[PDB]
Ligand binder design. Structure first.
Ligand SMILES: [Cl-]
Ligand SMILES: [Cl-]
Lengths: 173, 173
């Protein structure tokens, strides 16, 4: 995807995120070296058809934390639009309070490095990337379905990647 | 990935496949226009660690059939290696009988159009692509894990994509 290749360092980024406590903080993917990262890039905070897909991850953020994994959301929304949408109830198409950081990519540079930028317009597809503790991209999954991701499936994947890390000649049976 | 892009026609291919009945037949992705296709590209038929991932799809081929979906496997194995491995019991690292066609890509051209070729060596990663009845690429999922794919998850995804088609403005809930 653009510059994202399985088994190679996940493209780096340094951008401003709206943290769960409300603060704007400029974070880098490298800050999470030492732990797993489930980086989920979605089109926009505002949704009309289904709830923004990132919400289900916020809701289950603790299960990811339990697995030494940090979930980070991202969309081409500016940090103000992010905040604005977090302060808009889910029933009005918004996000509601968030338990994970939301990265802002209004310049679309991150969407590009991850190859999830749409061809005609400036918004992304739904891209999920599982990155390991060493910063290596391990899973790439893209689609334009407002229900593509399954939080249980992703949790199972992280477990498989960790198991593999801790064994490797043995089938994650 | 290579040329594969969500929402765009899935890269075309015409290659020889070992059919379920045992015959070699040159098949094209367009032949399946009208139905869904789950295209699963795996590295090699021969496995040491876990069973080759394509086996789970062969075993459950009828469930995809029920959903107007054809599963097609593919690897850089030649049509002779494919037949040889189909005729090697799963317990010897082989595949055992197959209910779905297995595409051969010894020239690695398909691996390339689908962006699943490794950088250093000539074998692929594990690439799953869900293509719709119109030949449009709908899901791209790559990883190098011998357990990355979940047959239940994929079946769910196909049902979701079909539902989107038949409705859209409504959430698959
Ligand atoms: Cl979404
Ligand atoms: Cl495999």
């Amino acid at each position: 995807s653009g510059n994202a290749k399985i088994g190679h360092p996940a493209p780096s980024f340094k951008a401003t995120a709206v943290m769960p406590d409300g603060q704007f903080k400029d974070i880098s993917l490298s800050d999470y070296k030492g732990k797993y990262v489930v980086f989920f890039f979605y089109p926009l905070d505002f949704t009309f058809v289904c709830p923004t897909e990132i919400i289900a991850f916020s809701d289950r953020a603790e299960e990811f934390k339990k697995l030494n994994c940090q979930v980070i959301g991202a969309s081409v929304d500016s940090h103000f639009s992010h905040l604005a949408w977090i302060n808009t109830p889910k029933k009005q198409g918004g996000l509601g309070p968030m338990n994970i950081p939301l990265v802002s990519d209004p310049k679309r540079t991150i969407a590009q490095d991850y190859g999830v930028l749409k061809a005609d317009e400036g918004i992304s597809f739904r891209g999920l990337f599982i990155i390991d503790d060493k910063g290596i991209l391990r899973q790439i999954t893209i689609n334009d379905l407002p229900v593509g991701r399954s939080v249980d499936e992703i949790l199972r994947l992280v477990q498989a990647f960790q198991f593999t890390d801790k064994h490797g000649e043995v089938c994650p049976a």
